[PDB]
Amino acid sequence: MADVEKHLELGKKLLAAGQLADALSQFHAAVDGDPDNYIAYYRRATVFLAMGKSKAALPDLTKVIQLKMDFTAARLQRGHLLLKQGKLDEAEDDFKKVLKSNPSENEEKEAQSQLIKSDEMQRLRSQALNAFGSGDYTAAIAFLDKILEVCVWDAELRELRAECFIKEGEPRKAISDLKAASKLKNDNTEAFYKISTLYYQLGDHELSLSEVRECLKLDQDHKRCFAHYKQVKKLNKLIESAEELIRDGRYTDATSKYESVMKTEPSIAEYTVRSKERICHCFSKDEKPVEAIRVCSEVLQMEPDNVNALKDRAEAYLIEEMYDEAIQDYETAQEHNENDQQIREGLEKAQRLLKQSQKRDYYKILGVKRNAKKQEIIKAYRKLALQWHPDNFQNEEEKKKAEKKFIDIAAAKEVLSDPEMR
């Protein structure tokens, strides 16, 4: 009908304008209106492909083919797709029938180049699995890395490689594949669960949560997903809230939410380690030096390179006027993060005070200002020197201590006469 014509035409304009989502809407309308119009099926597949929707394109393309078996450009299209999906054998059968069908000169060049690739894919697949079967994981990765340049939408193999990075002790390198695999399979809940937990495991709670919400959108009654859901949702509030508080500068509150974070997930180290960094942060930003040093130091026993923990402990040491240990920290921090304005401003501001503290102040032996007025000093000296005379002290060890204060008071008067003021 005219409708199916309008759907296709608006479909066309939209696609051309890059408007994939609504183009798809319209071809959907076009397919429903005339369920036997190969053009509708073809134009939809064309969008699906444009959108990365690998699974959805295939049944539409083979429909186009079922209806119009002479239409070889759709057979070549389905050829390409299946080769992306890593359904090699079938990708070969189409690429070959394309060649047996008076192809275009550009259709011959494609159908051929592809079979050439496909041949290597079959060898690389077999090497990949074989490597994997014997436990040669780094071997398997190298093969698979190559297959997946070409088979970019082989979910199964992506999964295998993720499993490789994992056995290798490199879990984070498996986020891409596992995320990809769930995207392609589209309505497989297990794929969302796997990616949701791998995220959780890495302390990626925000994603993990959103990613399991997907599982449950697919299956409301999925037991395992829901269990995990309760879990990360709980741990998400606690962490989100913890940080809300840290920005309000409610540090002891923040610290309490973090103790809850750790109590809610004890098994995974990252949730314990990262909580401690944040607690270390709370204490330091709260001017609680001994507590900062105690917690921050423990964080560094676990992660000696923790730039954030070093900055917070540095800050603690500054409070304690521990200028050496502050620089040592700001420095060992500067090693791991090369140019940080905060680190550098810390190292200079620590050094300035390390210098100024070694610089003896005769006024610091009593003077009201860097300029105590007139005979205020003479009043201070006579009393102090008379107070602090080793004669005063019967205790031998106590005396020797007065003496240093006496030499100090005396050396003060000596330098506070006439020109020696500067």
Numbering used by the authors: 34 to 455
Show sentences the authors wrote.
From the structure we can identify the probable binding site for BiP based on the position of the conserved histidine-proline-aspartate (HPD) motif which is necessary for Hsp40-Hsp70 interactions.
Finally, it was found that using this optimised condition to crystallise native protein, after enzymatic cleavage of the His-tag, yielded crystals that looked very similar but diffracted in space-group H32 (crystal form 2). These crystals provided the dataset used to refine the structure at 3.0 Å. The two crystal forms are very closely related. Crystal form 1 (P312) has one chain in the asymmetric unit and crystal form 2 (H32) has three chains. If chain A of crystal form 2 is superimposed on the single chain in crystal form 1, chains B and C are shifted only 2–4 Å and 1–2 Å, respectively, from symmetry-generated chains in the other space-group. The structure in the two crystal forms is very similar, with root mean square deviation (RMSD) of 0.8 Å (using chain A from crystal form 2). The three chains in the higher resolution structure of crystal form 2 show RMSD of 0.4 Å between A and B, 0.5 Å between A and C and 0.7 Å between B and C. In this crystal form, the density quality is highest, and B-factors lowest, in chain A, while B and C have weaker density. The linker between the TPR domain and the J domain (particularly residues 402–408) and a loop in the J domain (particularly residues 425–428) show highest flexibility, however even these regions are relatively well resolved in chain A of crystal form 2, which enabled model building. PISA suggests the oligomeric state to be monomeric in crystal form 2, but identifies a potential trimer, generated by the crystallographic symmetry, in crystal form 1.
